[PDB]
Amino acid sequence: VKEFLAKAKEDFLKKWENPAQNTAHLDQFERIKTLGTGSFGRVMLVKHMETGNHYAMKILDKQKVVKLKQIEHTLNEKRILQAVNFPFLVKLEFSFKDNSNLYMVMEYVPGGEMFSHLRRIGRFSEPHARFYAAQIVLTFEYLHSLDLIYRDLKPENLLIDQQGYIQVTDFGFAKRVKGRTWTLCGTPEYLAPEIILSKGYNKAVDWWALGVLIYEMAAGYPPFFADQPIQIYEKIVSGKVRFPSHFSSDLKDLLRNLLQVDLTKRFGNLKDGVNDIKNHKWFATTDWIAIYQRKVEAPFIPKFKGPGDTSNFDDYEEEEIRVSINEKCGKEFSEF
């Protein structure tokens, strides 16, 4: 672990200091379908005509990125993904840009969103939720050791691969930070108290979101919901939480420390750090090296009817890709 991290830190640092640029072009990829959308971009299944491989390509509208003030964030995302590497992290295979857009081509995860499976099934069993939480735990230990805070953990951003393992996606808010950070960002339901109270925060927000994930995974619904953020924010900064009746005691307990407003008392953010999590009762049956080695029995295996299948993704209105004859935001994205 400490031997693993060190080494891993060195590869990331190498790539982090000399990030790669313009390694592909649009015309080399064949457009096949939209599997996700956003406020400033969409995600599409794509096939690389030279290798005949299927990739996930994320197209970002540079003008939409500016209007929403996400230039730095976008520059952060690409810089971190071309340099990180982990069994549970989607892979940034290529990156480039054109007059109108920024592009990030990655490994395609055909299993679909945990969100979907979670919604359809209602809720996961603790052994099932525990299996994915472990993957998020190690991933956060990885990233964190490299001074990266993830900041956008949520079913919607978690993907199930073929072997049934999770793959974290979306690094729009990821950021290399040694020391306090202040940017207000994430998704309401998963916002730590420090964030909503505009007080500067650290990696500890990734552990609070972890506890949110787990609960939602074991209960079927979020520990703090309402039909409008403010009302959700009050629940969050309230210091109160209610657990379902089936939630085991170890589970209620683990969630109690994870969902701790007192960030000087919140698991993960303590002296023994992550170990207060990994060594916690609810995790007593978990073989961490096993998980890392992808040798543990997946609770559920999504079905693939063939290479480039997409039944596990919803249908989105398709919109043609447009590339103006003029560069739109040159200097802002020069380093992309």
């Binding site: 956003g38 406020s39 929403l68 003030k69 996400q70 964030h73 969100f115 919604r119 209602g122 956008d152 949520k154 919607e156 729009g172 808010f173 207000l184 960002c185 994430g186 998704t187 309401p188 339901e189 209960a219 079927g220 619904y221 979020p222 919901f225 309402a226 039909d227 953020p229 209610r242 379902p244």
Partner: peptide, 20 residues
């Protein structure tokens, strides 16, 4: 039931992030 109040709310779909 909470599960019901949940399912009856306008928050069971994909929840977008707040850039600002």
């Amino acid at each position: 039931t909470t599960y019901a109040d949940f399912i009856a709310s306008g928050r069971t779909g994909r929840r977008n992030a707040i850039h600002d």
